[PDB]
């Protein structure tokens, strides 16, 4: 059965917050109508949708994405009159004479993608001799910083960084609007954290940088199985995401007794799991070598006296 | 028999019943010595206007000799008995009673217990002193008490039942709403705002158009003799249940519905017909006072009213009962919107205005009330000012008044809450749409203007007569994201946009157009100047049209008094200016009341097909009435008032009525002049005996068979009597 | 449609020719051509105005437009569409459309909750001239044609026309039992002759009562095509003014004080439910909306109540429009029993939350049996969710004037209940009173029976029988009193619907506690 | 200035959820009304109450406490028709014939507190003779297990253990509801928890014993220190005691590369703490073998690569 849906930037029918313990968890193939606040939309571009309870939880997930705002561009114009743009909706901008778009065009159409614009709208200047842009955590293969139209330049990133096309070495060509692709050094991003039932996590992004950290939380009478904090790295998220389940089903880590070691270290321990404590060489045990996680408690750990 | 109800509805304060002077309990013996029990010989209410009861309740202004108090706050009385009261042996209570069918659980029979201390929020009486045969009480009313004129009785308990005072009309007590008491739903925490929005009896109404804001005074006169009884009579004529009159929401919801008369029910017959046969023209009234007294004395709808007249009369009603209230004027109001956030203008293919299809109109200004109250029927944070438009509009329940709609709900677009919020939101947040009605019958959206509707919203400033801009209390700064969030929230909850403005975009040409109309005195020629400016390296040819219309202030046109066409060529980066002279002889034969003119300038750019379109209004200036005073300005002394008026036209004015007013200085007076020759002046003089001290105002108005909506005023300091 | 049609108001509708009909738009597709002739598949907007439209065909030329003359044979009625997924009245089940729109014979439930009675009612929404009469009701309402596309507003305005205040309404309400110069409300067989009498006489019909108003309004809704049903609530707290408390007053000795007891609970009451989505509210409040065409004092005045969302009422979510606090209070009020002491103080003796809205019923789909729908209006009694709904209603302006906070259960552990056997009009019948002592104490009790003839609104006319008992309960025991009620006591006195109401009240002499019970019955 | 309040089980005025970025953060001496849902109430027992903005954030604090439910009372009765009770209101219950309450009387009063009723409503059967309970880590003064009305039992605890009153040897009285104090031996009872600031805990009680898990939390703009779950062993609290802070910069559990191990899992990894990684059999380490926590971020870990 599916627990209480934490709708993000939105709500379910508002009696369900009061009558939570009556209605939830819901049965599979039951449907539920949810909606976005103003300035937000569901991924289809609708203000309201039905989600459905499934073996996968609530599907599609009750997530409302923020509308893209009108861009701050110069040397050009925006054809569209509106201030805010729906997710999956598109918008037109164009250049003054002597300028070309971010896509190198006279005019460009951009889409507000699943989060953010498909390109940054800007009208730049015809680069007779393009200028190589700044390249933090990387190097160009030459001392040159200015190049003619149809000249090319190649660059390489530092240890643990990737080029704008996701390689570690990359080449670009000067054209009458700038470079054929823009040089940059970048890091791999961790995948979107899906909405959980019965709780939430506070720092929300479409994807996360290496060194981004996320904290999880639960609503009352539900508890977060697994870690309080999770971190992103270029290899991905380290732990599995924690879950707001019932009861506790989790114990804090034991001490290691003086003169001793354990059969399995762990990030977290759960009900029915054993930590087994072994004395060091030339030491002898007193108390149980076994301790077990039980109702969030442990049995008292052993002692290791000199042999 | 009568099976609908166990007792008839208690819905008239004018109605009474005869409570027994003795109620017997058990088998009462022959010849009981009832004189051993207390008997009431007199009751004192300390009701004099200089005394603590009226002074501490802020009810000393009313021209009424009975006791008037505000609910939820204590007041003194004294009872004199046949012998000293003896708590060991004497049970008695005060009773407050209202209507013909009073019941205790309905709050309309109120027994006041004698108590040791007054409990917070409860009816109770504390004995503060005893001396000889007299008991002095401090009485507290409940802060949720019914508002109206209560009968009062004193009742003594005995082993043989109840002995009670006979009907004594000297003791009847008005209980009103209490802005000063923290527990009242109408509580207002600021002293200067209570002074203005409750205790001030002279208003200012803002009219004209937003570039030339005109002003006039209005006598609310809520303290004048018989106005409070007339406000009770309005609720009795509504047949409003007395148990409901404790609620400021329902008093506002019902009282506003009584102001506009549909049929022979209600205070004012609405008319905008410019003729006003068999009644008084809506632009002639100086105040609410003579309207309400004409209603109370004739028992029939007064002829005639318009939006600011309804707002003035409803403001008197609210301030009289003690709900804090003000008029607000919205400039460029999208009235009769039916919750649509779009007003349509139709154009011919050549870009001229199609007058045949253009039947929506934007009012140059519109007036409604705000009433201050908490909203226990809504979620947290929607208290404070409630918009109530007493003018009828097509609504969720047919054609009716709108509100109380929370102003705080309107600003944020939370139009899911009651009452009528989508219709009030659309007055201030609609857009203009310009549509080419092509000859093939198709409609193409050429241009959109989201900036025109509700361009300013104003009210009288606290303690002075300048305008206070309150536009930001109704909507966020225009073009910012918070205006978009408010709009999107309104669209979630039943505000409407019939036409999708997605097939409309910035002009291809990058040509700007704007025009200025100079302000003018009525009967003078004036200049209108149109400018076109090119922001491009292209060369354009433009055909442009001016249509000038005489309109009522509701924007309804009567005649197109001037029409002109211009052909303009703009060179690269250049501009051009066209000057148009409008002559007095083009408009002077044809003006409506309030002397309002409306101009459309529209054009089509030949090389890009783009349409340029703008519209503006002017109101012609009319000279004020001159008021003068002679003799001593002292309360109770005779003072001489001179009202002078000079005809501004080139015609003889006929059946001219001049009106004079000023609450506490003079009753409503009026004077009839058979004719006034073209350049001539008239004088009227009265002797008036002012009865209120401090700063006061005289107010005058003029009307006739042709000219009307002409005003004047004078501030008079009146000295206190010796 | 109408005399002043405008395109932007939706009352003039040019239908464009198109290669394909779009979803949610007016248009016409040329599906076939045959010599002089063209066949169109026309589609109307799912938000279209409901009413009778004039039709024209118009041909464009360089010189102007050429149009067909007025042809009354082509006038087209456009109605609400429960079968279309885009319509605001869409109903997602065919048996429910077949019942709540296409069924023309209703069943109305009356009597009392222990002895429920049924009668048929001809809605007759299809009969000759009834559709034109529903349009005439909106024309007499002076309802703007651009507002007739909205099922909320058609329900809100149509319901206000059913009960006539002065002229200008379908039925004059009366409960006087005399019905001079009219037809008794209990005579009518169906809506058809009421509506055609209104349409032809052009003045209010004499007379109606709650099921007559509900019968006529159910015809009106089903005729325009809004899905609708009547519901009967047993023990309805009508005229509540959003207070959740009905007061019964007692004398000091425990007898009922008939001088002060003026709140009355209707043995049953009828209102309509109409089916629609609610785009004026936040999500979760569509489906059945309660509309009561019987006037009471609400926030506007003495008027019909609703449409109130039934899904809002179940959750106590009464901040939403229209009139929801007054509809909630009809199904959720308590009884309070108050001693009015000789010293003029009032003391709460006992409380009963179980009596009001004990059962709510409607006709079942595909048969004449009742369907219990009580659980659609309120949660199971004595459970936490009833309290959550009550607290939500008290946040949004429902009221409890008397604090029962100091009330406690009777420490005597005595309990009392009584039964009336069902009877035929003009037969004698037995009333049995039972007492049980669940304590080792002996008690003595004085108990009173008051038997009253009443209208079904609970309003009494006379006390036809009264008796007193003095009783001993010996420790941990039980005792029973019996009464025979005869035909010669009540038969000269009965009102329409033959309703009787019994109060049994008792004061325990030793503990001073009051026991109070009341039951209706209908002969 | 004060941030957007996170009202658990409650709400502020509904427009603040949409207009958040306009209204917040909010200036000092602004007053903000809030309310609890049905079934919940503020600290004062109100449904609706005001907070005020201060240099320390919101005050009074926006929390909503669940109403205590009527008990499923064994062998007893209650005075009231009520299902739910206000925070810090109280309720009266009593006994069936031959039974005695949790407090040993015929009747008992209980207060609704943050975690439930002040004592569990229950009636024990009422009788004459007491039985001496099993005495873990002690011995009785006599072979007798059965004691009559107002008889007494004396007992002594093991070396370094203490009685239920904290003596080494103790005596207690038999009464018809049971013992006046129950005979028991323990180590010295776990300390009465040190009340933290800017946070709070569950299982709130005056004294604790081996097990008895407690969970701590911080309030908005503060972050916890120590574990959330703590439990005492008979030797004392583990971990030692938690603290709240609005600047916590502590890491998640240490990231583990595939084919690697670490020297010990600590209960904490603060800013400046280090972990050493060792690759498993047939693998060698790429990057630094040590990793560090700084600003609540782990330094991105090494990789293990085949020999």
From Swiss-Prot, chains A, D:
User: Which stretches are transmembrane?
Assistant: none
| Effect noted on mutating residue 113 to F | In FA13BD; uncertain significance
Sushi domain residues:
1-65, 66-125, 128-187, 188-246, 249-306
User: Where do the record's glycosylation annotations fall on this chain?
Assistant: 139
Q: Where in the cell is it found?
A: Secreted
The intrachain disulfides are 2-53, 36-64, 68-112, 95-123, 130-174, 157-185, 190-232, 218-244, 251-293, 279-304
Outcome following mutation: residue 78 to N: In FA13BD; impaired interaction with F13A1
Task of the protein: The B chain of factor XIII is not catalytically active, but is thought to stabilize the A subunits and regulate the rate of transglutaminase formation by thrombin.
Describe its assembly: Tetramer of two A chains (F13A1) and two B (F13B) chains.
Instruction: Please tell me the disease that this Swiss-Prot or TrEMBL record associates with the protein.
Output: Factor XIII subunit B deficiency: An autosomal recessive hematologic disorder characterized by a life-long bleeding tendency, impaired wound healing and spontaneous abortion in affected women.
Protein's name in the database: Coagulation factor XIII B chain
Q: Which organism is it from?
A: Homo sapiens
| Gene name linked to the record | F13B
Shown segment, full-protein numbering: 24 to 330 of 661
From Swiss-Prot, chain B:
The reported effect of residue 159 to L is: In FA13AD; mild; no effect on intracellular protein abundance; no effect on protein-glutamine gamma-glutamyltransferase activity; no effect on alpha-2-antiplasmin to fibrin cross-linking activity; loss of fibrin alpha chain cross-linking activity; decreased clot fiber thickness
List each coiled-coil range: none
Principal place of residence: cytoplasm
Lineage, top-rank taxon, reads: Eukaryota
Q: What is the effect of changing residue 406 to L?
A: In FA13AD; uncertain significance
Q: Which residues are glycosylated?
A: 606
In alphabetical order, the GO MF annotations are: metal ion binding; protein-glutamine gamma-glutamyltransferase activity
Q: PTM per UniProt?
A: The activation peptide is released by thrombin.
Indicate the impact reported for residue 557 to L: In allele F13A*1A, allele F13A*2A and allele F13*(2)A
What disease does the record describe for this protein?
Answer: Factor XIII subunit A deficiency: An autosomal recessive hematologic disorder characterized by a life-long bleeding tendency, impaired wound healing and spontaneous abortion in affected women.
In which family does this protein belong, per the annotation? Belongs to the transglutaminase superfamily. Transglutaminase family.
Supply the name of the protein: Coagulation factor XIII A chain
Q: Which organism is it from?
A: Homo sapiens
Gene name? F13A1
């Amino acid at each position: 059965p599916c627990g209480f849906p934490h709708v993000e930037n939105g709500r379910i029918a508002q009696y369900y917050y009061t009558f939570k313990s009556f209605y939830f968890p819901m049965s599979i193939d039951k449907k539920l109508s949810f909606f976005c606040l103003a300035g937000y939309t569901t991924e289809s571009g609708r203000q309201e949708e039905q989600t459905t309870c499934t073996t996968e939880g609530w599907s599609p997930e009750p997530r409302c994405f923020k509308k893209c705002t009108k861009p701050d561009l110069s040397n050009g114009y925006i054809s569209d009159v509106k201030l805010l743009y729906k997710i999956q909706e598109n918008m037109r901008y164009g250049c003054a004479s002597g300028y070309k778009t971010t896509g190198g065009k006279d005019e460009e159409v951009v889409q507000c993608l699943s989060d953010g614009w498909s390109s940054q709208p800007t009208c730049r200047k015809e680069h007779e001799t393009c200028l190589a842009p700044e390249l933090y955590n990387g190097n160009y293969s030459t001392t040159q910083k200015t190049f003619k139209v149809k000249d090319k330049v190649q660059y390489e990133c530092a240890t643990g960084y990737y080029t704008a096309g996701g390689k570690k070495t990359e080449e670009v060509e000067c054209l009458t609007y700038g470079w054929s692709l823009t040089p940059k050094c970048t890091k791999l991003k961790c995948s979107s954290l899906r909405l959980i039932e019965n709780g939430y996590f506070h720092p929300v992004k479409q994807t996360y940088e290496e060194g981004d950290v996320v904290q999880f939380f639960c609503h009352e009478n539900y508890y977060l199985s697994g870690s309080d904090l999770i971190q992103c790295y270029n290899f991905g998220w380290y732990p599995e995401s924690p879950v707001c389940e019932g009861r506790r089903n989790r114990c804090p880590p034991p001490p290691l007794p003086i003169n001793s070691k354990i059969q399995t270290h762990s990030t977290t321990y759960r009900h029915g799991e054993i930590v087994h404590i072994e004395c060091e060489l030339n030491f002898e045990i007193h108390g149980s070598a076994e301790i077990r996680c039980e109702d969030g408690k442990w049995t008292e750990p052993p002692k290791c006296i000199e042999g | 028999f009568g099976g609908r109800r166990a007792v008839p509805p208690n819905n008239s304060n004018a109605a009474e019943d005869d409570l027994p002077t003795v109620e017997l309990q058990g088998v009462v013996p022959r010849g009981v010595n009832l004189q051993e029990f207390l008997n009431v010989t007199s009751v004192h209410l300390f009701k004099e206007r200089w005394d603590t009861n009226k002074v501490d309740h802020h009810t000393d202004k009313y021209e009424n000799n009975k006791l008037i108090v505000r609910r939820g706050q204590s007041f003194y009385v004294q009872i004199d008995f046949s012998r000293p009261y003896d708590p060991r042996r004497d049970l008695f209570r005060v009773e407050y009673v209202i209507g013909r069918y009073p019941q205790e659980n309905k709050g309309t029979y109120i027994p006041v217990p004698i108590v040791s201390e007054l409990q917070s929020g409860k009816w109770g009486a504390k004995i503060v002193m005893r001396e000889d045969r007299s008991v002095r009480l401090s009485i507290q009313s409940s802060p949720k008490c019914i508002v109206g004129k209560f009968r009062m009785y004193v009742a003594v308990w005995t082993p043989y039942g109840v002995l009670r005072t006979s009907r004594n009309p000297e003791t009847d007590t008005y209980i009103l709403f209490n802005p000063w008491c923290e527990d009242d739903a109408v509580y207002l925490d600021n002293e200067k705002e209570r002074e203005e929005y409750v205790l001030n009896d002279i208003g200012v109404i803002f009219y004209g158009e937003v570039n030339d804001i005109k002003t006039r005074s209005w006598s609310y006169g809520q303290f004048e003799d018989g106005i409070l009884d007339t406000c009770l009579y309005v609720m009795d004529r509504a047949q409003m249940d007395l148990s409901g009159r404790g609620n400021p929401i329902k008093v506002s919801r019902v009282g506003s519905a009584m102001v506009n008369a549909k049929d022979d029910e209600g205070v004012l017959v609405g008319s905008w017909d410019n003729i006003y046969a068999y009644g008084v023209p809506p632009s002639a009234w100086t105040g609410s006072v003579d309207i309400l007294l004409e209603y109370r004395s004739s028992e029939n709808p007064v002829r005639y009213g318009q939006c600011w007249v309804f707002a003035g009369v409803f403001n008197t009603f609210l301030r009289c009962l003690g709900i804090p209230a003000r008029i607000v004027t919205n400039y460029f109001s999208a009235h009769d919107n039916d919750a649509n956030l779009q007003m349509d203008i139709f154009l011919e293919e050549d870009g001229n205005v199609n007058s045949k299809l253009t039947k929506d109109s934007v009012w140059n200004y519109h007036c409604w009330n705000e009433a201050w109250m908490t909203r226990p029927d809504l979620p947290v944070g929607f208290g404070g000012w409630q918009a109530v438009d007493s003018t009828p509009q097509e609504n969720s329940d047919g054609m009716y008044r709108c509100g109380p709609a929370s102003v705080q709900a309107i600003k944020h677009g939370h139009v899911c809450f009651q009452f009528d919020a989508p219709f009030v939101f659309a007055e201030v947040n609609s857009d203009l749409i310009y549509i080419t009605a092509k000859k093939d019958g198709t409609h193409v959206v050429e241009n959109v203007d989201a900036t025109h509707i509700g361009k300013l919203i104003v009210t009288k400033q606290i303690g002075g007569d300048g305008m206070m801009d309150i536009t930001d209390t109704y909507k966020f700064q225009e073009g910012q994201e918070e205006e978009r969030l408010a709009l999107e929230t309104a669209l979630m909850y039943g505000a409407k946009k019939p036409l999708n403005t997605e097939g409309v975009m910035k002009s291809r040409s990058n040509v700007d157009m704007d025009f200025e109309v100079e302000n003018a005195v009525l009967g003078k020629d004036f200049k209108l100047s149109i400018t076109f400016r090119n922001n491009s390296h292209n060369r354009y040819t433009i055909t442009a049209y001016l249509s000038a219309n005489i309109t009522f202030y509701t924007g309804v046109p009567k005649a197109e008094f001037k029409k002109e066409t211009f052909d303009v060529t703009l060179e690269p980066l250049s501009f051009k200016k066209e000057a148009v002279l409008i002559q007095a002889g083009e408009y002077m034969g044809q003006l409506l009341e309030q002397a309002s003119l409306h101009f459309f300038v529209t054009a089509r750019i030949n090389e890009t097909r783009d349409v340029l379109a703008k519209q503006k209004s002017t109101v012609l200036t009319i000279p004020e009435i001159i008021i003068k005073v002679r003799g001593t300005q002292v309360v109770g002394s005779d003072m001489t008032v001179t009202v002078e008026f000079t005809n501004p036209l080139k015609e003889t004015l006929r059946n001219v009525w001049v009106h004079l007013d000023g609450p506490g200085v003079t009753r409503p007076m009026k004077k009839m002049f058979r004719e006034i020759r073209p350049n001539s002046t008239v004088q009227w003089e009265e002797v008036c005996r002012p009865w209120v001290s401090g700063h006061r105002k005289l107010i005058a108005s003029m009307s006739s068979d042709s000219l009307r909506h002409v005003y004047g005023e004078l501030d008079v300091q009146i000295q206190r009597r010796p």
